[PDB]
Amino acid sequence: PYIEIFEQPRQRGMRFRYKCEGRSAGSIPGEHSTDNNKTFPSIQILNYFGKVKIRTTLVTKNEPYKPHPHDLVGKDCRDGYYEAEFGPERRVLSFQNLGIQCVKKKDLKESISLRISKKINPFNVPEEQLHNIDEYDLNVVRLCFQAFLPDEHGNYTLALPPLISNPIYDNRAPNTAELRICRVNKNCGSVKGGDEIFILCDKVQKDDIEVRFVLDNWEAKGSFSQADVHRQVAIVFRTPPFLRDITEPITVKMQLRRPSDQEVSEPMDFRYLPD
Amino acid sequence: PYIEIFEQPRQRGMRFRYKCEGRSAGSIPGEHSTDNNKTFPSIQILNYFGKVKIRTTLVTKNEPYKPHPHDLVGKDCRDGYYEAEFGPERRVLSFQNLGIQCVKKKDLKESISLRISKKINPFNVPEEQLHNIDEYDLNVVRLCFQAFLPDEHGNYTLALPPLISNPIYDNRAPNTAELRICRVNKNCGSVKGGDEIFILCDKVQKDDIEVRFVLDNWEAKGSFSQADVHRQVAIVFRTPPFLRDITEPITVKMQLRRPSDQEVSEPMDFRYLPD
DNA sequence: GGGTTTAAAGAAATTCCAGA
DNA sequence: TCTGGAATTTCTTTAAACCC
């Protein structure tokens, strides 16, 4: 008797809304989820068939998961966390309306004290280790599913192991935003490589970013310095040479990449040409 | 005697700082101010020689000059205005440390009530008129010099006419900002005109901006819609054809321009080439 | 001539608010 | 409504100062 995540929540593309931004802090989507046939984070209770209760709470991306300041808002959420009873019904439990409301940095402290003075601690993490405000990440959280089964006749106390979902990063924050190449001025260049390209893109961090050409076992970096990143939304760089040379146009894949976590943007075709 | 401005304050390129930003709201420089030989807003008392006092305060850009909410901070500034004495000494009066602290839109009201409950009203502008909150531009102010001469044996009461300087636009705002082309991908194209250019620039407003090519009586606009403006700091457009054809390379002047006020950025050479 | 109070450029954190 | 360009307010690497 344990819990299992059927479909993990998408990690990029969702903004954490502030309280000042309405009540719909959004609805976190699933991984697979598509525009047409969209899906939602869902889990299933293996080794069990019966009435019960589940509690979705937000936790850190840190090895020893401690409650997070941000709130989970939406249908069946109160006090920053979702809780609901579920029947022996369909195996898969989907959770549609699950938004993330983020607290202003000021609220950060006050916020965690209440998680303590509330019992919200699915991992019984050392209370004092929990006041470790200076070190947390308000740009990324994790969903902590906590299913409690029926006790010796009566309510739900038999709690199953707290399962934790993949991390979800706030797309509004520069260091967690999804990588996206908006526009380029040239989709091809010489194999000698040295062509100067202008990439318009979503906010990145000149500190932690790199354009990366790739094909099979081959891969090279676009060539540019930090000064070439314009107001975080544009990169002026030069194409790297291709290994060897060729006689016919050879298209490779070009893409933004973030070293720190190696996250990459959707690729784009770049055709190398014979001199 | 009265007061003449020996040097007007530069109108563009200075940010209005918030209180949260510290004690230094910068230092307003005067037009003539070069880089190796920088200058400052200065005025001189004509028709007079002797000890005295002067008071620099901020006023609106509206015909009837009323005190402005923003504060003037810096050496000898207090309660939002600068005041100082000055013996019969040197004619010219330069004011270096003169910064502009801007109030949050919330503070706007509360702010003006205190200018009233303070006497700050160099132009004796009517009461309920000086309450035109929803008509004050927080992006532009004017310096109001008010020199007071010595009275019949005593201090300074003989107040000379309030002089007002040229406007000073809050570079924090895009429509009051200085226009600046940071970088371009091509400095030349065909006279047929149709070459796609990427301009990296300082924050502009897609709503109110246009690239203008010009030479003598000739002038044409770069071609692009709003969607071509990337996050306010980059423009992808196409060069306009040059009038007639040409035998040799003919360089013209390229520059960002803001229709609403016809303010323009510093020009840049664009050479048209014969097909 | 390059090393450590500070203030401009620059990125961040909010709050705004209308287009899709 | 949900999404996402942006005007606003805050604060961090730089960038007017000093160190001597």
Curated annotation (Swiss-Prot), chains A, B:
Instruction: Report the gene name.
Output: REL
Subunit organization = Homodimer; component of the NF-kappa-B c-Rel-c-Rel complex. Component of the NF-KAPPA-B p65-c-Rel complex.
What biological process terms from GO does the record include?
apoptotic DNA fragmentation; canonical NF-kappaB signal transduction; inflammatory response; innate immune response; non-canonical NF-kappaB signal transduction; positive regulation of transcription by RNA polymerase II; response to cytokine
Protein name in UniProt:
Proto-oncogene c-Rel
Q: Does the keyword Cell membrane apply?
A: no
Phosphoserine modification, residue list: S260
A cellular-component GO term for this protein: nucleus
> Which keywords accompany this UniProt record?
DNA-binding, Nucleus, Phosphoprotein, Proto-oncogene
GO molecular function: any one?
Answer: DNA binding
Q: What does this protein do?
A: Proto-oncogene that may play a role in differentiation and lymphopoiesis. NF-kappa-B is a pleiotropic transcription factor which is present in almost all cell types and is involved in many biological processed such as inflammation, immunity, differentiation, cell growth, tumorigenesis and apoptosis. NF-kappa-B is a homo- or heterodimeric complex formed by the Rel-like domain-containing proteins RELA/p65, RELB, NFKB1/p105, NFKB1/p50, REL and NFKB2/p52.
The RHD domain sits at 1-275
**Residues represented out of the complete protein:** 7 to 281 of 598
| Location of the protein in the cell | Nucleus
| Keyword Transcription regulation assigned | no
